C-alpha cells in the first residue's frame, strides 16, 4: 500500500528507502514582493542653483 | 473645462512640467552669464 505519508515532519514516503527522500516538497513562484518609493512633497518646491 | 477633449491637461500639470524643467535651464544659464 504505497502511501505518500508526509515527507516533511520526518514520516518518509512508503516508496522511499533508508538513504533517500523526496527531492521537491514545495513550489516557488519566483515573483518577489517589493514596496514602492515614498512620495516627495518638499523636493518639487526647491529650485537648484548648480554653481 | 475649456475644450471638449476627453482627457484635459489642467494648469497643474503644465506648472509641474515647468518646475521640473527649470533645474537644468537654471544650471545652463550660469555659463551664458
UniProtKB/Swiss-Prot annotation, chain A:
The chain holds residues 1 to 51 of 401 of the full protein. It is found in: Virion. It comes from Enterobacteria phage N4 (Bacteriophage N4). Assembles, to form an icosahedral capsid with a T=9 symmetry, about 60 nm in diameter, and consisting of 535 capsid proteins. This is Major capsid protein. The lineage of its organism: Viruses, Duplodnaviria, Heunggongvirae, Uroviricota, Caudoviricetes. It comes from the Viruses.
Swiss-Prot record, chain B:
It is found in: Virion. Signal peptide: none annotated. Forms the portal vertex of the capsid. This portal plays critical roles in head assembly, genome packaging, neck/tail attachment, and genome ejection. The portal protein multimerizes as a single ring-shaped homododecamer arranged around a central channel. Homododecamer. This is Probable portal protein. It comes from Enterobacteria phage N4 (Bacteriophage N4). The lineage of its organism: Viruses, Duplodnaviria, Heunggongvirae, Uroviricota, Caudoviricetes. The chain holds residues 19 to 51 of 763 of the full protein.
Amino acid at each position: 500500500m504505497l502511501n505518500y505519508n508526509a515527507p516533511t515532519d520526518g514520516q518518509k514516503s512508503s516508496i522511499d528507502g533508508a538513504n533517500s527522500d523526496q527531492m521537491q516538497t514545495f513550489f516557488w513562484l519566483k515573483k518577489a514582493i517589493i514596496t514602492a518609493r515614498k512620495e516627495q512633497y518638499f523636493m518639487p518646491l526647491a529650485s537648484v542653483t548648480n554653481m | 473645462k475649456l475644450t471638449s477633449w476627453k482627457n484635459e491637461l489642467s494648469l497643474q500639470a503644465l506648472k509641474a512640467d515647468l518646475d521640473a524643467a527649470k533645474p537644468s535651464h537654471t544650471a545652463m544659464m550660469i555659463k551664458v552669464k
